[PDB]
Amino acid sequence: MGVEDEPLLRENPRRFVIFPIEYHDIWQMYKKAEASFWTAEEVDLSKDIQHWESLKPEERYFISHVLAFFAASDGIVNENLVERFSQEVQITEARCFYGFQIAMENIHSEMYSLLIDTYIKDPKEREFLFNAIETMPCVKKKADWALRWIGDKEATYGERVVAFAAVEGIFFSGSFASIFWLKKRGLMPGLTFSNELISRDEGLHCDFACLMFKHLVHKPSEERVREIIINAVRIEQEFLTEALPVKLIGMNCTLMKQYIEFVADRLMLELGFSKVFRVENPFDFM
Amino acid sequence: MGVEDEPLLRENPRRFVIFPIEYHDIWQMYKKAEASFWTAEEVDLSKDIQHWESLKPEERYFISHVLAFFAASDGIVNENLVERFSQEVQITEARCFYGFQIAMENIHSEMYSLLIDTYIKDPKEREFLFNAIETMPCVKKKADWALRWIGDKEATYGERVVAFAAVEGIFFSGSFASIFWLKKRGLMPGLTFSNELISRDEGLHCDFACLMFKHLVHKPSEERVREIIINAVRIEQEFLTEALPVKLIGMNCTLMKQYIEFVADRLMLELGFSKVFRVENPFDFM
Ligand code: NA
Ligand code: NA
């Protein structure tokens, strides 16, 4: 108390010794991550440029921007893992998971940056997209929100693990759905395949967050969690309807708003709480 | 000065943004690491037991203690990477390498622990070996030496990177040669195959340390480096001739002492200095 009464966070003199495994649930998630290892080089991008060139300008604009957003957000997730989560959690099985997540985030960032480089030849445009946190207003609200949770010296691990589940689970959900929409339109195999791998990985990262949350003795209240999750949903809805409208690629903004609330509800249930919006998933393709 | 004039260590606002790659040499080492990814599950240990059971009791003693030394030392290397190197180095390319090295060390540590579990069924003997830092006098000198460099609040990155290159390159060298000796005897293919994979990784980790060292503006002196390396050599020689004699598996202690000095010279040259001992490699199998 405050942290000595938390198995996840309390002193572990065996933290750097791997065996024997004591948290089999946590360990199995690390094994799952390790088993689905992939590299950017495995994704075949050789059919994408033709499809990219056939797109309308506004579609290319939307796609390049979603890519820039993902690449930038990964860096924030990564920073939080490197500076906070991988340091403060003292159980070996979780340290292994977080260590592997850091490695996978670098691969995700590389994949996005390689997609940018493949589609966008102009070096000034590449640089613009790489520096999205500073160059792109659409990205700011989400980036600032995530970064505040890294700098927050008060917020408990319980609150911060929820916030990052919201980053990887709510902040990414609209953009993931967007690319699955492109798949439904039969467009850009490399983008859509890499999107399958990455959203799968991110789903696993959110599942892990929920597992860690359940292992906590002093959780934040349902009220506090609702508050964090609702805030995140509103930011994500703003991003997809105002800052970078999904209309640009032919999607229904109204149904997209509903999808984000469905996603949040599922996260809430997975965190062991009650649904908040009680809406259906409007997308058959998700 | 003192850190703000070091490109590896000075403020990098772009540190969590992956592209563009600016340090292509550092980046290529990360790509090499990434391309050689493997998991313990790829190593078949099933054909080892028969050979294991045919050894003399003191050969089994020697091997299990080497395994336990390796698993323990992995956790110290890992601790240093997690708490220090991956935090203090500000260039993205090296941060990616170190992130991937943390993951691989966890895989090494699992491999060593699985080798132990496979060869040793007795749960008391397993626990003895997993807790080697506390239970096994033969590892104390190396463990303490390595751990001092993590806790040293005054030593420079330049001195510590050398120290950990000595850990991964000198403290491991005799044990790797021990296992390569077992291969020459045609014994235990699982052990010796995992040893090939791990020694190769550790070789890369040492190469990376040398690359980082070359990128430093303020390096420690040749004399200071010599002192660190010579000290490491003496400790390793003690380990292999006195604390856990390689005689126990039919190797010559004098030729082993000479091999360590050869390894140290090669590292000295790789660091950009002169030879120290000027001895040949006594082992044709290395
Ligand atoms: Na442990
Ligand atoms: Na960078």
Side-chain angles (χ1 to χ4, degrees), chain A residues 103-148:
Chain A
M104 286 319 297
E105 297 299 341
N106 289 332
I107 287 166
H108 293 179
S109 291
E110 183 182 18
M111 183 73 245
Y112 288 123
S113 301
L114 173 59
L115 289 164
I116 290 158
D117 279 357
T118 304
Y119 303 160
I120 306 281
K121 296 300 171 200
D122 173 23
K124 302 172 204 155
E125 187 63 25
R126 291 180 172 183
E127 189 33 56
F128 176 80
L129 294 173
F130 300 147
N131 204 21
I133 291 168
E134 296 188 348
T135 64
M136 288 167 46
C138 63
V139 144
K140 188 183 165 70
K141 232 148 166 56
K142 286 194 267 179
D144 283 346
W145 196 87
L147 293 157
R148 270 191 296 281

Coordinates of all heavy atoms in Angstrom, one line a residue, chain A residues 103-148:
Chain A
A103 N 8.8 -4.6 -29.4 CA 9.4 -5.0 -30.6 C 8.4 -5.1 -31.8 O 8.6 -4.6 -32.9 CB 10.0 -6.4 -30.4
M104 N 7.1 -5.5 -31.4 CA 6.1 -5.5 -32.5 C 5.6 -4.1 -32.9 O 5.3 -3.9 -34.0 CB 4.9 -6.4 -32.0 CG 5.2 -8.0 -32.1 SD 6.1 -8.5 -33.6 CE 5.0 -8.0 -34.9
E105 N 5.7 -3.2 -32.0 CA 5.3 -1.8 -32.3 C 6.3 -1.2 -33.3 O 5.9 -0.4 -34.2 CB 5.1 -0.9 -31.0 CG 4.0 -1.3 -30.0 CD 2.6 -1.3 -30.6 OE1 2.4 -0.6 -31.6 OE2 1.7 -1.9 -29.9
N106 N 7.6 -1.5 -33.1 CA 8.6 -1.0 -34.0 C 8.4 -1.5 -35.4 O 8.6 -0.8 -36.4 CB 10.0 -1.2 -33.5 CG 10.3 -0.4 -32.3 OD1 9.8 0.7 -32.2 ND2 11.1 -0.9 -31.4
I107 N 7.9 -2.8 -35.5 CA 7.6 -3.4 -36.7 C 6.3 -2.8 -37.4 O 6.3 -2.6 -38.6 CB 7.5 -5.0 -36.6 CG1 8.9 -5.5 -36.4 CG2 6.8 -5.6 -37.8 CD1 9.0 -7.0 -35.9
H108 N 5.3 -2.5 -36.5 CA 4.1 -1.8 -37.0 C 4.5 -0.5 -37.6 O 4.0 -0.1 -38.7 CB 3.1 -1.6 -35.9 CG 2.5 -2.9 -35.4 ND1 1.5 -2.8 -34.3 CD2 2.6 -4.2 -35.7 CE1 1.2 -4.1 -34.1 NE2 1.8 -4.9 -34.9
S109 N 5.3 0.3 -36.9 CA 5.7 1.6 -37.3 C 6.5 1.5 -38.6 O 6.3 2.4 -39.5 CB 6.6 2.3 -36.3 OG 5.8 2.7 -35.2
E110 N 7.4 0.5 -38.7 CA 8.1 0.3 -40.0 C 7.2 0.0 -41.1 O 7.4 0.5 -42.2 CB 9.1 -0.8 -39.8 CG 9.9 -1.0 -41.0 CD 10.9 -2.1 -40.9 OE1 10.8 -2.9 -40.0 OE2 11.9 -2.1 -41.7
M111 N 6.1 -0.8 -40.9 CA 5.2 -1.3 -41.9 C 4.5 0.0 -42.5 O 4.4 0.1 -43.7 CB 4.2 -2.3 -41.4 CG 3.3 -2.9 -42.4 SD 4.1 -4.0 -43.5 CE 4.0 -3.1 -45.1
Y112 N 4.0 0.8 -41.6 CA 3.3 2.0 -42.0 C 4.2 3.0 -42.8 O 3.8 3.5 -43.8 CB 2.7 2.7 -40.7 CG 1.6 2.0 -40.1 CD1 1.6 1.6 -38.8 CD2 0.4 1.7 -40.9 CE1 0.5 0.9 -38.3 CE2 -0.7 1.1 -40.4 CZ -0.6 0.7 -39.0 OH -1.8 0.1 -38.5
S113 N 5.4 3.1 -42.3 CA 6.4 4.0 -42.9 C 6.8 3.5 -44.3 O 7.1 4.3 -45.2 CB 7.6 4.2 -42.0 OG 7.1 4.7 -40.8
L114 N 6.9 2.2 -44.4 CA 7.1 1.5 -45.7 C 6.0 1.7 -46.7 O 6.1 1.9 -47.9 CB 7.5 0.1 -45.5 CG 7.7 -0.9 -46.6 CD1 8.8 -0.4 -47.6 CD2 8.0 -2.3 -46.1
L115 N 4.7 1.6 -46.1 CA 3.6 1.9 -47.0 C 3.6 3.3 -47.5 O 3.5 3.6 -48.7 CB 2.3 1.6 -46.2 CG 2.0 0.1 -46.0 CD1 0.9 -0.1 -44.9 CD2 1.6 -0.6 -47.3
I116 N 3.9 4.3 -46.6 CA 4.0 5.7 -47.0 C 5.1 5.8 -48.1 O 4.8 6.4 -49.2 CB 4.4 6.6 -45.8 CG1 3.1 6.7 -44.9 CG2 4.9 8.0 -46.2 CD1 3.4 7.1 -43.5
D117 N 6.2 5.2 -47.9 CA 7.3 5.3 -48.9 C 7.1 4.7 -50.2 O 7.6 5.2 -51.2 CB 8.6 4.7 -48.3 CG 9.3 5.7 -47.4 OD1 8.9 6.8 -47.2 OD2 10.4 5.3 -46.8
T118 N 6.3 3.6 -50.2 CA 5.9 2.9 -51.4 C 4.9 3.8 -52.2 O 5.1 3.9 -53.5 CB 5.2 1.5 -51.1 OG1 6.2 0.8 -50.3 CG2 4.9 0.8 -52.3
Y119 N 3.9 4.3 -51.6 CA 2.9 5.1 -52.2 C 3.2 6.5 -52.6 O 2.7 7.1 -53.5 CB 1.6 5.1 -51.4 CG 1.1 3.7 -50.9 CD1 0.2 3.6 -49.8 CD2 1.3 2.6 -51.7 CE1 -0.3 2.4 -49.5 CE2 0.8 1.3 -51.3 CZ 0.0 1.2 -50.2 OH -0.5 0.0 -49.8
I120 N 4.1 7.1 -51.7 CA 4.4 8.5 -51.8 C 5.9 8.7 -52.1 O 6.7 8.4 -51.2 CB 4.1 9.3 -50.5 CG1 2.6 9.1 -50.0 CG2 4.5 10.8 -50.6 CD1 1.6 9.9 -50.8
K121 N 6.2 9.1 -53.3 CA 7.6 9.3 -53.7 C 8.2 10.6 -53.3 O 9.4 10.7 -53.0 CB 7.8 9.0 -55.2 CG 7.4 7.6 -55.6 CD 8.3 6.5 -54.9 CE 7.8 5.1 -55.2 NZ 8.2 4.1 -54.1
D122 N 7.4 11.7 -53.2 CA 7.9 13.0 -52.9 C 8.4 13.2 -51.5 O 7.6 13.1 -50.5 CB 6.7 14.0 -53.2 CG 7.0 15.4 -52.7 OD1 8.2 15.9 -52.6 OD2 6.0 16.2 -52.5
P123 N 9.7 13.5 -51.3 CA 10.4 13.5 -50.0 C 9.8 14.5 -49.1 O 9.8 14.3 -47.8 CB 11.8 13.9 -50.4 CG 12.0 13.5 -51.8 CD 10.6 13.8 -52.4
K124 N 9.3 15.6 -49.6 CA 8.6 16.7 -48.7 C 7.3 16.2 -48.2 O 7.0 16.5 -47.0 CB 8.4 18.0 -49.5 CG 9.7 18.6 -50.2 CD 9.3 19.7 -51.1 CE 10.4 19.9 -52.1 NZ 10.0 20.5 -53.4
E125 N 6.6 15.4 -49.0 CA 5.3 14.8 -48.5 C 5.6 13.7 -47.5 O 4.9 13.6 -46.5 CB 4.5 14.3 -49.7 CG 3.1 13.8 -49.3 CD 2.2 14.9 -48.7 OE1 2.5 16.1 -49.0 OE2 1.2 14.6 -48.0
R126 N 6.6 12.9 -47.8 CA 7.0 11.8 -46.8 C 7.3 12.5 -45.4 O 6.8 12.0 -44.4 CB 8.2 11.1 -47.3 CG 8.0 10.2 -48.5 CD 9.3 9.5 -48.9 NE 9.1 8.5 -49.9 CZ 10.0 7.7 -50.4 NH1 11.3 7.8 -50.0 NH2 9.7 6.8 -51.4
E127 N 8.2 13.5 -45.4 CA 8.6 14.2 -44.2 C 7.4 14.8 -43.4 O 7.3 14.6 -42.2 CB 9.6 15.2 -44.5 CG 10.3 15.8 -43.2 CD 10.4 14.9 -42.0 OE1 11.0 13.8 -42.2 OE2 9.9 15.2 -40.9
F128 N 6.5 15.5 -44.2 CA 5.2 15.9 -43.6 C 4.5 14.8 -42.9 O 4.0 15.0 -41.8 CB 4.4 16.4 -44.8 CG 3.0 16.9 -44.4 CD1 2.8 18.1 -43.8 CD2 1.9 16.0 -44.6 CE1 1.5 18.5 -43.4 CE2 0.7 16.4 -44.2 CZ 0.4 17.6 -43.6
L129 N 4.4 13.6 -43.5 CA 3.6 12.5 -43.0 C 4.3 11.9 -41.8 O 3.7 11.6 -40.8 CB 3.3 11.5 -44.1 CG 2.3 12.0 -45.2 CD1 2.2 10.9 -46.3 CD2 0.9 12.3 -44.7
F130 N 5.6 11.7 -41.9 CA 6.4 11.2 -40.7 C 6.3 12.1 -39.5 O 6.4 11.5 -38.3 CB 7.9 11.0 -41.1 CG 8.1 10.0 -42.2 CD1 9.1 10.1 -43.1 CD2 7.2 8.9 -42.4 CE1 9.3 9.2 -44.1 CE2 7.4 8.0 -43.4 CZ 8.5 8.1 -44.3
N131 N 6.2 13.4 -39.6 CA 6.1 14.3 -38.5 C 4.7 14.7 -38.1 O 4.5 15.9 -37.7 CB 7.0 15.5 -38.8 CG 7.5 16.3 -37.6 OD1 7.6 15.7 -36.5 ND2 7.8 17.5 -37.8
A132 N 3.8 13.8 -38.3 CA 2.3 14.1 -38.2 C 1.9 14.7 -36.8 O 1.0 15.5 -36.8 CB 1.5 12.8 -38.4
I133 N 2.6 14.3 -35.7 CA 2.3 14.9 -34.4 C 2.4 16.5 -34.5 O 1.6 17.2 -33.9 CB 3.1 14.3 -33.3 CG1 2.7 12.8 -33.1 CG2 3.0 15.1 -32.0 CD1 3.6 12.0 -32.2
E134 N 3.4 16.9 -35.2 CA 3.6 18.4 -35.4 C 3.0 19.0 -36.6 O 2.7 20.2 -36.6 CB 5.1 18.7 -35.4 CG 5.8 18.4 -34.1 CD 7.2 18.9 -34.0 OE1 7.7 19.3 -35.1 OE2 7.8 18.9 -32.9
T135 N 2.8 18.2 -37.7 CA 2.3 18.8 -38.9 C 0.9 18.6 -39.2 O 0.3 19.4 -40.1 CB 3.1 18.2 -40.1 OG1 2.8 16.8 -40.2 CG2 4.6 18.4 -40.0
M136 N 0.2 17.7 -38.6 CA -1.2 17.4 -38.9 C -2.2 17.6 -37.8 O -2.2 16.9 -36.8 CB -1.3 15.9 -39.4 CG -0.7 15.7 -40.8 SD -0.5 13.9 -41.2 CE -2.1 13.2 -40.7
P137 N -3.0 18.6 -37.9 CA -4.0 19.0 -36.9 C -5.0 17.8 -36.5 O -5.4 17.7 -35.4 CB -4.8 20.1 -37.5 CG -3.8 20.8 -38.5 CD -3.0 19.6 -39.1
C138 N -5.3 17.0 -37.5 CA -6.3 15.9 -37.3 C -5.9 14.9 -36.2 O -6.7 14.4 -35.5 CB -6.6 15.2 -38.6 SG -5.3 14.3 -39.4
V139 N -4.6 14.8 -36.1 CA -3.9 13.8 -35.2 C -3.7 14.4 -33.8 O -3.5 13.6 -32.8 CB -2.5 13.5 -35.8 CG1 -1.4 13.3 -34.8 CG2 -2.7 12.3 -36.8
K140 N -3.8 15.7 -33.6 CA -3.4 16.3 -32.4 C -4.2 15.9 -31.1 O -3.6 15.7 -30.1 CB -3.5 17.9 -32.5 CG -2.9 18.6 -31.3 CD -3.1 20.1 -31.5 CE -2.9 20.8 -30.2 NZ -1.5 20.8 -29.8
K141 N -5.5 15.9 -31.2 CA -6.4 15.6 -30.0 C -6.0 14.2 -29.4 O -5.9 14.1 -28.2 CB -7.8 15.7 -30.5 CG -8.7 16.5 -29.6 CD -9.8 17.2 -30.5 CE -11.0 17.8 -29.6 NZ -10.5 18.8 -28.7
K142 N -6.0 13.2 -30.3 CA -5.6 11.8 -29.9 C -4.2 11.8 -29.4 O -4.0 11.2 -28.3 CB -5.8 10.8 -31.0 CG -7.3 10.5 -31.2 CD -7.5 9.3 -32.1 CE -7.7 9.6 -33.6 NZ -7.9 8.4 -34.4
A143 N -3.2 12.4 -30.1 CA -1.8 12.4 -29.7 C -1.6 13.0 -28.3 O -1.0 12.4 -27.4 CB -0.9 13.0 -30.7
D144 N -2.2 14.2 -28.1 CA -2.1 14.9 -26.8 C -2.7 14.1 -25.7 O -2.2 14.0 -24.6 CB -2.9 16.2 -26.9 CG -2.1 17.3 -27.6 OD1 -0.9 17.2 -27.8 OD2 -2.8 18.4 -27.9
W145 N -3.9 13.5 -26.0 CA -4.6 12.6 -25.0 C -3.7 11.5 -24.5 O -3.6 11.3 -23.3 CB -5.9 12.1 -25.6 CG -6.9 11.5 -24.6 CD1 -7.9 12.3 -24.0 CD2 -7.1 10.2 -24.2 NE1 -8.7 11.4 -23.2 CE2 -8.2 10.1 -23.3 CE3 -6.4 9.0 -24.5 CZ2 -8.6 9.0 -22.7 CZ3 -6.8 7.8 -23.9 CH2 -7.9 7.8 -23.0
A146 N -3.2 10.7 -25.4 CA -2.3 9.6 -25.1 C -1.1 10.1 -24.3 O -0.8 9.5 -23.3 CB -1.9 8.8 -26.4
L147 N -0.4 11.1 -24.8 CA 0.8 11.6 -24.2 C 0.6 12.2 -22.8 O 1.4 12.1 -21.9 CB 1.5 12.7 -25.1 CG 2.1 12.2 -26.4 CD1 2.2 13.4 -27.4 CD2 3.5 11.6 -26.2
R148 N -0.6 12.7 -22.5 CA -1.0 13.2 -21.1 C -0.9 12.0 -20.2 O -0.5 12.2 -19.0 CB -2.3 13.9 -21.1 CG -2.2 15.4 -21.3 CD -3.6 16.1 -20.9 NE -4.7 15.7 -21.8 CZ -4.9 16.2 -23.0 NH1 -4.0 17.1 -23.6 NH2 -5.9 15.8 -23.7

